Amino acid sequence: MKVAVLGAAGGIGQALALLLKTQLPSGSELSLYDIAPVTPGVAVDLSHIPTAVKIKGFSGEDATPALEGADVVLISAGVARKPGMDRSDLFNVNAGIVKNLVQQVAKTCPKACIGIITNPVNTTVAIAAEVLKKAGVYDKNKLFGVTTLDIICSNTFVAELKGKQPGEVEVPVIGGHSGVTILPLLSQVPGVSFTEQEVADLTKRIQNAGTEVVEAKAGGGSATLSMGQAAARFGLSLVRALQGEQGVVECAYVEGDGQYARFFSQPLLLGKNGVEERKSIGTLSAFEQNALEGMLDTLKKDIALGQEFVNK
Amino acid sequence: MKVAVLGAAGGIGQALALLLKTQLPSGSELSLYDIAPVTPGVAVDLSHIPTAVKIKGFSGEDATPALEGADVVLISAGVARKPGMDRSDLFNVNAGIVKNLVQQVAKTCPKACIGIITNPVNTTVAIAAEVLKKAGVYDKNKLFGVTTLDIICSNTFVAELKGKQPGEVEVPVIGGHSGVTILPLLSQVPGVSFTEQEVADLTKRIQNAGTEVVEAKAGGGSATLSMGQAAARFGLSLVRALQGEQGVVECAYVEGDGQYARFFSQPLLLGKNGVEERKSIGTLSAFEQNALEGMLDTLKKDIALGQEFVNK
Numbered sequence: 006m007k008v009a010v011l012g013a014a015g016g017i018g019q020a021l022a023l024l025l026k027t028q029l030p031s032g033s034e035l036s037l038y039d040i041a042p043v044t045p046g047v048a049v050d051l052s053h054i055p056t057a058v059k060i061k062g063f064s065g066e067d068a069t070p071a072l073e074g075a076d077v078v079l080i081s082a083g084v085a086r087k088p089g090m091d092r093s094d095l096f097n098v099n100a101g102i103v104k105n106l107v108q109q110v111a112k113t114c115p116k117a118c119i120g121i122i123t124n125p126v127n128t129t130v131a132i133a134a135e136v137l138k139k140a141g142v143y144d145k146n147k148l149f150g151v152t153t154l155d156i157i158c159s160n161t162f163v164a165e166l167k168g169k170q171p172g173e174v175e176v177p178v179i180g181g182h183s184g185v186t187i188l189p190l191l192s193q194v195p196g197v198s199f200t201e202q203e204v205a206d207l208t209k210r211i212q213n214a215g216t217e218v219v220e221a222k223a224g225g226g227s228a229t230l231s232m233g234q235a236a237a238r239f240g241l242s243l244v245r246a247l248q249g250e251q252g253v254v255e256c257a258y259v260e261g262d263g264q265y266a267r268f269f270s271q272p273l274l275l276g277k278n279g280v281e282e283r284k285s286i287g288t289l290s291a292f293e294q295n296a297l298e299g300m301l302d303t304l305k306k307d308i309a310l311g312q313e314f315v316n317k
Numbered sequence: 318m319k320v321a322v323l324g325a326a327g328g329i330g331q332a333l334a335l336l337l338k339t340q341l342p343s344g345s346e347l348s349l350y351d352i353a354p355v356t357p358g359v360a361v362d363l364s365h366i367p368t369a370v371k372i373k374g375f376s377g378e379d380a381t382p383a384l385e386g387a388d389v390v391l392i393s394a395g396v397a398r399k400p401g402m403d404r405s406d407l408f409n410v411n412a413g414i415v416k417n418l419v420q421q422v423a424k425t426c427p428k429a430c431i432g433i434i435t436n437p438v439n440t441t442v443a444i445a446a447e448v449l450k451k452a453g454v455y456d457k458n459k460l461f462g463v464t465t466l467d468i469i470c471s472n473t474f475v476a477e478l479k480g481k482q483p484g485e486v487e488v489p490v491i492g493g494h495s496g497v498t499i500l501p502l503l504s505q506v507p508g509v510s511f512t513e514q515e516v517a518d519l520t521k522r523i524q525n526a527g528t529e530v531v532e533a534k535a536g537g538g539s540a541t542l543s544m545g546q547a548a549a550r551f552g553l554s555l556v557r558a559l560q561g562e563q564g565v566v567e568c569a570y571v572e573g574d575g576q577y578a579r580f581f582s583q584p585l586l587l588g589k590n591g592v593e594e595r596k597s598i599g600t601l602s603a604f605e606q607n608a609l610e611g612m613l614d615t616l617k618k619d620i621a622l623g624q625e626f627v628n629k
């Protein structure tokens with residue numbers, strides 16, 4: 006099976022391509038693509054690592070050469086926030102490239118699962134959906150917003166706080182991928198019970214994790230490595246399910262039953278064709294219930310903004 | 318165990334910290350250091366990955382807080398080469414950085430094992446030694462020049478050629494870490510046989526693998542991801558050995574018996590005190606015999622340079 010990374014030259018893309026080179030299954034194929042002229046050399050550098058994963062790099066305006074026969078297309082192209090900005094600012098910046106990149110996909114590998122990393126996810130996914138719809142090949146079970154970073158961050162904070170082994174904690178995270186739209190279902194963390202203030206303090210910390218990294222890098226980029234690792238966990242999950250592994254569950258922003266919004270991140274059962282079943286968000290706590298409602302308007306706005314950009 | 322990465326904000330440094338954060342044994346501590354102000358931000362980014370490895374970053378002029386208690390110190394600091402340059406050409410821009418870093422290691426954690434990644438390793442390892450000898454704390458079982466990257470490139474090219482599974486091949490490589498001092502013992506590869514010609518092409522390819530990447534990145538930088546992977550393997554081998562594991566063997570550049578030069582790279586058994594035993598380079602073919610000879614001049618020359626730089 007072939008995986009294609011769009012935006013492989015940036016900080017997130019390189020960390021991701023490194024992880025995938027070293028962790029995809031023997032026999033997999035990985036093609037990298039980016040406008041950056043360094044791109045082909047990023048592949049040559051990775052080609053030197055001794056794993057049964059064939060790698061190739063392409064530069065240019067045409068991504069087409071690395072989308073041929075692609076099964077999974079991970080999109081991390083774009084740019085990221087510096088100190089001050091939010092996640093609803095570089096909009097025209099990236100939305101454009103997402104728009105462009107999603108188009109080449111539709112023409113070249115419509116039936117592949119597409120994972121969107123480029124922020125702001127809430128909006129960029131909607132834009133990709135509209136482009137896929139417009140081109141007449143949209144498969145709503147094959148378009149996901151990679152929100153995995155919010156999951157691994159919540160795992161880490163819950164572990165440290167409660168003194169648990171970090172690999173043994175998995176917290177479900179629902180909603181969206183930015184600020185208020187990010188909701189940790191802490192009431193559902195087995196074996197651990199929290200106090201209202203911990204839930205409050207933790208939720209805040211989890212929602213502001215990205216800012217924590219920006220202020221620390223003092224305007225030297227945002228999270229790139231952990232983002233890389235997370236995108237890496239998600240790509241492998243997608244790849245495992247596509248190969249028939251059963252029981253693969255990941256929360257991800259997708260087009261659902263519209264119960265809360267056209268797009269919403271909830272627990273997903275993945276299978277040979279992408280989303281196999283959209284799990285329920287389960288029983289919420291008063292706090293989660295409270296928080297779930299107050300972010301709605303914000304979420305559909307992002308979605309809105311996304312739809313607009315394409316249809317007009 | 319505590320691992321200190323010096324020069325952590327560069328491309329090698331960051332790819333290396335990413336791999337070590339997810340791969341060191343639970344319980345380990347990872348310290349990052351670079352003069353670049355972004356460094357502490359890099360650690361915070363990595364601190365978001367849920368593994369039981371505590372990580373912190375430090376910036377500034379003084380590496381002291383990074384070095385307190387380190388058991389392993391990896392030095393990837395310094396400038397990489399530009400298209401056209403050679404590994405020898407980096408001596409001037411890197412000698413002082415190495416000198417400064419190693420002195421702080423000497424004052425703060427003299428017992429730690431030191432891995433010099435900074436090129437030209439043939440020369441920078443010699444500088445480090447003299448510096449340690451002058452601080453009066455040099456342990457030749459504790460100072461190594463990381464050449465692991467020549468190994469993994471060798472296992473890759475050999476596998477692609479002979480149709481073997483990359484993970485099953487281990488070609489040993491001795492000499493030094495440069496265009497003509499890198500000698501792969503293709504004759505000792507258990508299982509495969511090569512033709513006069515094959516050995517000829519493979520050998521050149523392995524020796525210029527570094528340039529292959531610099532050229533391919535067209536000025537963007539040299540091997541950084543394959544290099545981060547190689548230094549990670551080496552660092553994992555060292556740590557497993559410091560912990561008591563047996564049978565740990567890695568080729569590295571160190572002060573040996575002197576049979577070929579003050580420093581030479583050969584198979585080394587690693588143990589709880591650093592280099593445990595330097596294994597014999599074994600059986601050489603006609604060709605390998607020629608190579609080994611052809612290069613000694615350059616090597617002693619390369620070492621001579623690092624020495625007078627500290628002495629003179």
Ligand SMILES: NC(=O)c1ccc[n+]([C@@H]2O[C@H](COP(=O)([O-])OP(=O)(O)OC[C@H]3O[C@@H](n4cnc5c(N)ncnc54)[C@H](O)[C@@H]3O)[C@@H](O)[C@H]2O)c1
Pocket residue numbers: 323324325326327328329330350351352353393394395396397398407411414417433434435436437438463464466467494538539540541544
């Ligand atoms: N052993 C090998 O196989 C091998 C392979 C490639 C490169 N290298 C060498 O490793 C070094 C690293 O290259 P790179 O690709 O990461 O380059 P890079 O330019 O991308 O990063 C180098 C980093 O060194 C840091 N640095 C410089 N002086 C410092 C000091 N005094 N204290 C702390 N940090 C300092 C810089 O801030 C920078 O982040 C170079 O000397 C390169 O030639 C080794």
